[PDB]
């Protein structure tokens, strides 16, 4: 709706900082997974003898 967008423009920058907060959470989740699992530099393999 165009009229609602025009009156939503008068409320300032609330959605910019809501988008910034959600983007920070989204980057933080990938950072959490990378710090937990990617702790080894090389990909070691088991020998065929078991």
């Amino acid at each position: 709706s165009t009229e609602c967008s025009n009156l939503l423009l008068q409320y300032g920058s609330f959605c910019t900082q809501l988008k910034r907060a959600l983007t920070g959470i989204a980057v933080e989740q990938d950072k959490n997974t990378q710090e937990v699992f990617a702790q080894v530099k090389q990909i070691y393999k088991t020998p065929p003898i078991k």
Binding site: Y11, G12, F14, Q17, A21, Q39
Partner: protein
């Protein structure tokens, strides 16, 4: 004036809420730094990757 007061009050409350969450994160990082100063510097650590 009441409309402007409500808008500016909402903006200030939003700022205080993000400041509180960032203060909690900074306090956790400072606790980690204090633990690393106690264990890394004042002694010798046997903890792996610490």
């Amino acid at each position: 004036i009441d409309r402007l007061i409500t808008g500016r009050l909402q903006s200030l409350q939003t700022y205080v809420t993000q400041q509180l969450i960032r203060a909690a994160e900074i306090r956790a990082s400072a606790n980690l730094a204090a633990t690393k100063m106690s264990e890394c510097v004042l002694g010798q650590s046997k903890r792996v990757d610490f």
